[PDB]
Curated annotation (Swiss-Prot), chain B:
It is found in: Cytoplasm. Component of the small ribosomal subunit. The gene is RPS27. Component of the small ribosomal subunit. The ribosome is a large ribonucleoprotein complex responsible for the synthesis of proteins in the cell. Required for proper rRNA processing and maturation of 18S rRNAs. It comes from Entamoeba histolytica (strain ATCC 30459 / HM-1:IMSS / ABRM). The chain holds residues 2 to 33 of 84 of the full protein. It comes from the Eukaryota. Belongs to the eukaryotic ribosomal protein eS27 family. This is Small ribosomal subunit protein eS27.
UniProtKB/Swiss-Prot annotation, chain D:
It comes from Entamoeba histolytica (strain ATCC 30459 / HM-1:IMSS / ABRM). It is found in: Cytoplasm. This is Large ribosomal subunit protein uL2. Belongs to the universal ribosomal protein uL2 family. The chain holds residues 156 to 206 of 257 of the full protein. Disulfide bonds: none annotated. Component of the large ribosomal subunit. The ribosome is a large ribonucleoprotein complex responsible for the synthesis of proteins in the cell.
Length: 60, 32, 144, 51, 128, 95
RNA sequence: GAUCGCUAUAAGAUGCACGAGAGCGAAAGCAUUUUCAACUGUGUCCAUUAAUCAAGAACGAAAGUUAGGGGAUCGAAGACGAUCAGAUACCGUCGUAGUCCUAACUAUAAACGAUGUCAACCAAGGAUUGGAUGAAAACCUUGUUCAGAACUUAAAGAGAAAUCUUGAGUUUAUGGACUUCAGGGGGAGUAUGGUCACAAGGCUGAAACUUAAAGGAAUUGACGGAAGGGCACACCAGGAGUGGAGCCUGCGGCUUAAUUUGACUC
């Protein structure tokens, strides 16, 4: 019950210091855009795995 | 005004535009 | 089951109400549902087992910053408007011109309402006030 | 208080209002106030009494 | 229970708490009311979107069980004399409800603005 | 001397204007001295605007917008980044 | 049986959005609808009736006093809960006076445009409120002109400079008319005297003594638990560690006849 996602673009770094990436993933299952907070090295081409796509982590 | 004009003799057009008391010779604007 | 004692009733039928039949119940229904059309969506109606009210979105979406708010009482509200050839930013009516508008703003309304909407007519009829000041948006916001 | 709906009640306020706002200034005026009442005016304190 | 029916949802989510309150159309008789602080164990987490997201999910379950397959949303914030802006969990609750296969009808703002207001807490100099 | 020509407020021919309450700290501030901003915001944010349309019982329902006018004072108007400190010759900018 | 939701009832207060460098008012001030002031128009009347004003008088925010009514919201004093070394404060909850109306007092404010009142001249420009006069046929566009709140530019005038230009211009090239105030800083708006007020207090109001500065506008620098833009193993993700144990060594301390001395955050 884990739904993967494909990164499309990177919106910058947040979280006080630079250790957290705000990327704009999309879900190849149904083409539903989702914005998630990511920790670690990421490029646009790489994909991601999420155990919860229901939370739109816009961070206000 | 900065552009000085003759005021001892005023133009006929400029007289009819000034305030009735501010003309060279104040005249009423009333008829009859 | 704390809901095993509840029997649903009914009220175009626009909805259902749950009871434990008692029914000074007041029910609000959008005019779009009542008239099965989306043109009357910015209105509300109240029924007692009552009244009508302009929706909050439409009340705040018709008030302009640089006009004069004309309001009377069946509540009615109207606004002065700009012109196609108008240049100046501000279009305000004098205190005397407003009283001319208000002397026919509701007087016209009370004329037909007492003698006798959901189509148009009277809200737009009172705008032509136009002979004293240009007016565009006129609504009957609430009826008690 | 909860009362039956058949109780009669005259509408309005009772006349002679604001009577006590006037300061009785003397002893005599307070003594004449009890002309048509009981006998309780000159009240001697308990602590000014024998045991 | 019944067949499909139309209800209303009065989501009152301020900066401190989130109320998910769904009644019938008349607004007199309720079905379920789950609060933001009902499903958390910290007084500072009552306004979090996750607290309101979880609350909205369980409201749909009880509304499905009664056949209330749609809801008229009336969204409000504590706008009497205080801030009229709905808190953080206000928008999260609406998104979570519609994600549970709930048909969403009218969305309206019922934040009561003061036509004429009384005094506001704080004094002249405000909350320093 | 005078840091501002109009003394910060915007009243010229009147000797008194009714006070208003700041929207952030609730501080009594005059009507003209206040910082007035008009906010137009949809109740459903853009991250969830399409979520409603997938499951909406209506047919051509257009989501309304919130209409609130916010008034701030200087103390939390600057602190809230609504306005900033400007240069001496850049203060006269009024657009 | 709180919070929350619909419907009703009564009083208190309030007058959002429209609401503006817009209007009126001598000032204070004036915001729901259903006696007075000013401008303009004027081939109307009087003829110097005029300006400023010691003494004198009216109005005079908020708080405050006295007696009634009202007492919903907020809330000097006060009570709790936090924070802190303490906090008797900022933050949270409650609450008497007060906040409201009437009648009578008090007469002070950053009562500010810190700019007295009347009068003549005064560069350029956009725009606004209320009228009069033309074209465009009440509203909208435009021309002339009177009054009003303001604004932009100035290579000019003034100033110590900031700035002012509907003057803070026409001033050492000094005089249009009138009233008030000030003479280095403290003492001090204190004492005494007089007078007004139910009271708090207001109006008038020095000296003895003490002291080389107090103060005004702008420059540079420094500083900010002010903002904006960049940078650093400064930090994030980590590796090795030191601090813990024995020992080499340096420093302080104790000791001694001497335990030689410089260096003491980076």
């Amino acid at each position: 019950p884990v739904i993967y996602a494909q990164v499309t673009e990177i919106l910058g770094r947040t979280g006080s210091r630079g250790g957290v990436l705000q990327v704009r993933c999309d879900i190849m299952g149904e083409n539903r855009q989702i914005l998630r907070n990511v920790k670690g090295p990421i490029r646009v081409g790489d994909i991601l795995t999420l155990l919860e796509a229901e939370r739109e982590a816009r961070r206000l | 005004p900065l552009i000085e004009v003759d005021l001892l003799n005023p133009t006929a057009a400029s007289e009819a535009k000034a305030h009735k008391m501010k003309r060279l010779v104040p005249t009423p604007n009333s008829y009859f | 089951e704390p809901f095993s004692k509840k029997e649903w009733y009914n009220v175009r039928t626009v909805g259902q109400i749950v009871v434990n039949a008692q029914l000074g119940r007041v029910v609000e229904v959008n005019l779009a549902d009542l008239m099965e059309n989306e043109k009357f969506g910015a209105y509300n109606y109240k029924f007692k087992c009552h009244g009508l009210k302009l929706t909050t979105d439409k009340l705040r979406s018709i008030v302009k910053k640089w006009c004069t708010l004309i309001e009377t009482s069946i509540f009615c509200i109207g606004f002065t408007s700009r012109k196609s050839n108008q240049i100046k930013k501000t279009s305000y009516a004098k205190s005397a011109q407003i009283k001319k508008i208000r002397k026919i703003m509701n007087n016209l309304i009370t004329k037909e309402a007492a003698s006798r909407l959901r189509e148009n007519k009277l809200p737009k009829e009172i705008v032509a006030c136009s002979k004293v000041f240009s007016m565009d948006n006129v609504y009957i916001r609430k009826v008690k | 208080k909860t009362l039956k709906s058949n109780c009669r009640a005259m509408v309005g306020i009772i006349a002679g209002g604001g009577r006590t706002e006037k300061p009785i200034l003397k002893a005599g005026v307070a003594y004449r106030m009890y002309k048509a009442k009981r006998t309780t005016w000159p009240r001697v304190r308990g602590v000014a009494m024998n045991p | 229970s019944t067949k499909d029916a139309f209800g209303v949802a009065h989501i009152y989510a301020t900066f401190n708490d989130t109320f998910v309150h769904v009644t019938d159309i008349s607004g007199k008789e309720t079905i379920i009311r789950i609060t933001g602080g009902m499903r958390v164990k910290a007084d500072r987490d009552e306004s979090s979107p996750y607290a309101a997201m979880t609350a909205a999910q369980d409201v749909a379950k009880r509304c499905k069980d009664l056949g209330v397959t749609s809801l008229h949303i009336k969204m409000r914030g504590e706008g009497g004399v205080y801030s009229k802006t709905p808190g953080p969990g206000a928008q999260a609750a609406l998104r979570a409800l519609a994600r549970a296969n709930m048909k969403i009808g009218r969305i309206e703002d019922v934040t009561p603005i003061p036509t004429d207001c009384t005094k506001r807490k704080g004094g002249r100099r405000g909350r320093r | 001397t005078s840091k501002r020509r109009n003394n910060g407020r915007s009243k010229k021919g009147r000797g008194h204007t009714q006070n208003v309450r700041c929207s952030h700290c609730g501080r009594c501030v005059p009507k003209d001295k206040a910082i007035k901003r008009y906010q137009i915001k949809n109740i459903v944010e853009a991250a969830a605007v399409r979520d409603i349309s997938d499951n909406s019982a209506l047919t051509k329902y257009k989501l309304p917008k919130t209409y609130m006018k916010l008034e701030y004072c200087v103390s939390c108007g600057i602190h809230g980044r609504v306005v900033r400190v400007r240069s001496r010759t850049d203060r006269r900018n009024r657009l």
